Short mmCIF file of C-alpha atoms in Angstrom, two decimals:
data_model
loop_
_atom_site.label_atom_id
_atom_site.label_comp_id
_atom_site.label_asym_id
_atom_site.label_seq_id
_atom_site.Cartn_x
_atom_site.Cartn_y
_atom_site.Cartn_z
CA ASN T 1 17.74 4.72 -7.49
CA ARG T 2 20.45 4.93 -10.16
CA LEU T 3 22.26 7.64 -8.19
CA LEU T 4 22.02 5.68 -4.95
CA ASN T 5 23.33 2.46 -6.46
CA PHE T 6 26.17 4.22 -8.29
CA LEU T 7 27.18 6.25 -5.24
CA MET T 8 27.01 3.18 -3.02
CA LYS T 9 29.22 1.49 -5.59
CA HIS T 10 31.91 4.20 -5.55
CA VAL T 11 32.79 4.53 -1.84
CA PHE T 12 36.29 3.39 -0.92
CA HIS T 13 38.92 6.07 -1.91
CA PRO T 14 42.09 5.00 0.01
CA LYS T 15 42.47 8.14 2.16
CA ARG T 16 40.52 8.36 5.38
CA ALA T 17 38.92 11.80 5.18
CA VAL T 18 37.40 11.20 1.76
CA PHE T 19 36.05 7.88 3.04
CA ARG T 20 34.35 9.63 5.97
CA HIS T 21 33.05 12.25 3.53
CA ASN T 22 31.56 9.63 1.19
CA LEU T 23 29.98 7.78 4.10
CA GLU T 24 28.43 11.04 5.29
CA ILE T 25 27.00 11.65 1.81
CA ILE T 26 25.52 8.13 1.55
CA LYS T 27 24.14 8.32 5.10
CA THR T 28 22.56 11.70 4.47
CA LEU T 29 21.11 10.44 1.19
CA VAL T 30 19.32 7.46 2.71
CA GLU T 31 18.39 9.62 5.69
CA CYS T 32 16.59 12.16 3.53
CA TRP T 33 15.23 9.86 0.80
CA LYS T 34 13.22 7.24 2.77
CA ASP T 35 10.32 6.97 0.29
CA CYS T 36 11.77 5.80 -3.00
CA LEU T 37 13.43 3.11 -0.92
CA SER T 38 15.24 0.84 -3.46
CA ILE T 39 17.73 -0.22 -0.77
CA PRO T 40 20.32 -2.13 -2.75
CA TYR T 41 21.54 -5.51 -1.57
CA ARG T 42 23.95 -8.17 -2.94
CA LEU T 43 26.65 -5.57 -3.40
CA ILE T 44 26.90 -5.27 0.37
CA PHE T 45 27.17 -9.06 0.35
CA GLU T 46 29.89 -8.71 -2.28
CA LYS T 47 31.56 -6.21 0.04
CA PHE T 48 31.79 -8.34 3.18
CA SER T 49 31.83 -11.87 1.70
CA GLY T 50 35.62 -12.03 1.45
CA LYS T 51 37.88 -14.79 2.71
CA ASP T 52 41.66 -14.56 3.51
CA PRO T 53 41.45 -12.73 6.87
CA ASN T 54 44.67 -10.76 6.45
CA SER T 55 42.69 -8.11 4.60
CA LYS T 56 40.71 -5.16 5.91
CA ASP T 57 38.42 -5.53 2.92
CA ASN T 58 35.11 -6.34 4.58
CA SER T 59 34.93 -3.09 6.54
CA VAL T 60 32.94 -1.38 3.79
CA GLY T 61 29.97 -3.73 3.83
CA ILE T 62 29.56 -3.94 7.59
CA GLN T 63 29.83 -0.17 7.83
CA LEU T 64 27.21 0.20 5.09
CA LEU T 65 24.93 -2.26 6.89
CA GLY T 66 25.44 -0.25 10.06
CA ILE T 67 24.52 2.85 8.08
CA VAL T 68 21.30 1.28 6.86
CA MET T 69 20.51 -0.16 10.30
CA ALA T 70 21.31 2.90 12.41
CA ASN T 71 18.36 4.70 10.83
CA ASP T 72 15.68 2.07 10.19
CA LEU T 73 15.06 -0.27 7.26
CA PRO T 74 15.40 -4.05 7.85
CA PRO T 75 18.17 -6.04 6.14
CA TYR T 76 15.74 -8.46 4.49
CA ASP T 77 17.81 -10.69 2.26
CA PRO T 78 15.69 -13.53 0.66
CA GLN T 79 13.42 -11.29 -1.43
CA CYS T 80 15.69 -9.77 -4.07
CA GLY T 81 19.21 -10.70 -3.01
CA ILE T 82 20.17 -14.19 -1.86
CA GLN T 83 19.17 -16.67 0.84
CA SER T 84 19.24 -15.38 4.40
CA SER T 85 20.77 -18.45 6.03
CA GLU T 86 23.93 -17.99 3.95
CA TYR T 87 24.01 -14.19 4.19
CA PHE T 88 23.99 -14.13 7.98
CA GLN T 89 26.41 -17.06 7.96
CA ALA T 90 28.83 -14.93 5.93
CA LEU T 91 28.46 -12.11 8.47
CA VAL T 92 28.94 -14.26 11.58
CA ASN T 93 31.80 -16.04 9.85
CA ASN T 94 33.59 -12.74 9.27
CA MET T 95 33.20 -12.14 13.01
CA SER T 96 35.96 -14.72 13.49
CA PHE T 97 38.41 -12.76 11.28
CA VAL T 98 40.45 -11.77 14.33
CA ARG T 99 43.53 -10.01 13.07
CA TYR T 100 42.48 -6.36 12.59
CA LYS T 101 40.45 -4.53 15.19
CA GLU T 102 38.32 -2.62 12.66
CA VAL T 103 36.38 -5.63 11.34
CA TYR T 104 35.50 -8.11 14.08
CA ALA T 105 34.43 -5.71 16.84
CA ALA T 106 32.41 -3.75 14.26
CA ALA T 107 30.76 -6.94 13.02
CA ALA T 108 29.95 -7.86 16.61
CA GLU T 109 28.32 -4.49 17.27
CA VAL T 110 26.29 -4.54 14.07
CA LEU T 111 25.21 -8.09 14.88
CA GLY T 112 23.97 -6.73 18.18
CA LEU T 113 22.05 -4.09 16.26
CA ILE T 114 20.56 -6.73 13.95
CA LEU T 115 19.48 -8.87 16.91
CA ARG T 116 18.03 -5.89 18.77
CA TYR T 117 15.88 -4.89 15.82
CA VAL T 118 14.74 -8.40 14.86
CA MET T 119 13.71 -9.17 18.44
CA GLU T 120 11.22 -6.32 18.69
CA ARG T 121 10.08 -6.73 15.09
CA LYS T 122 8.62 -10.14 15.95
CA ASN T 123 9.39 -12.35 12.99
CA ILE T 124 10.64 -15.86 13.73
CA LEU T 125 14.16 -15.91 12.43
CA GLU T 126 15.91 -14.40 15.47
CA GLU T 127 16.48 -17.75 17.18
CA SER T 128 18.54 -19.13 14.29
CA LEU T 129 21.04 -16.29 14.04
CA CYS T 130 21.02 -15.91 17.81
CA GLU T 131 22.03 -19.57 17.97
CA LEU T 132 24.59 -19.01 15.22
CA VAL T 133 26.33 -16.13 16.98
CA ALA T 134 26.09 -18.10 20.22
CA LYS T 135 27.73 -20.98 18.38
CA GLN T 136 30.53 -18.65 17.33
CA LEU T 137 30.90 -17.46 20.90
CA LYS T 138 30.91 -20.98 22.36
CA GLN T 139 33.63 -21.68 19.84
CA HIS T 140 35.41 -18.62 21.18
CA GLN T 141 35.39 -19.24 24.95
CA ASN T 142 37.85 -22.16 24.82
CA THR T 143 40.50 -20.86 22.45
CA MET T 144 40.97 -17.11 22.92
CA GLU T 145 39.46 -15.60 26.05
CA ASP T 146 40.48 -12.04 25.14
CA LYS T 147 38.60 -12.12 21.87
#
């Protein structure tokens, strides 16, 4: 657990190849561990909860959530981190950060992954975030048809 939380803290490293290397190490770690779960939240929230959308600074958290979702494990927030209705609101609000193509399309895809898992795992919260992303999209059909 201490290794996983430290290594998931130290990720960024401004060059691209070392970033892809570190993401491969973290992905392979949670791929092979699976049993001492200790999947750490609230630092991912600290990663993608940024304002001022002239900054490619929320890529790390959405990519880490896509890492943890592409395997398995649910992103259950209101058990040890913070309340879910603000967490998902932070995610769907970063979906509107339409300046850099690395953040909003990625957030849209990982939102699709979230919805696809939470539909089949039948717990009744999928209608709220489905309505929230639909609210973002209905905001988006009038103003910018491309995006």
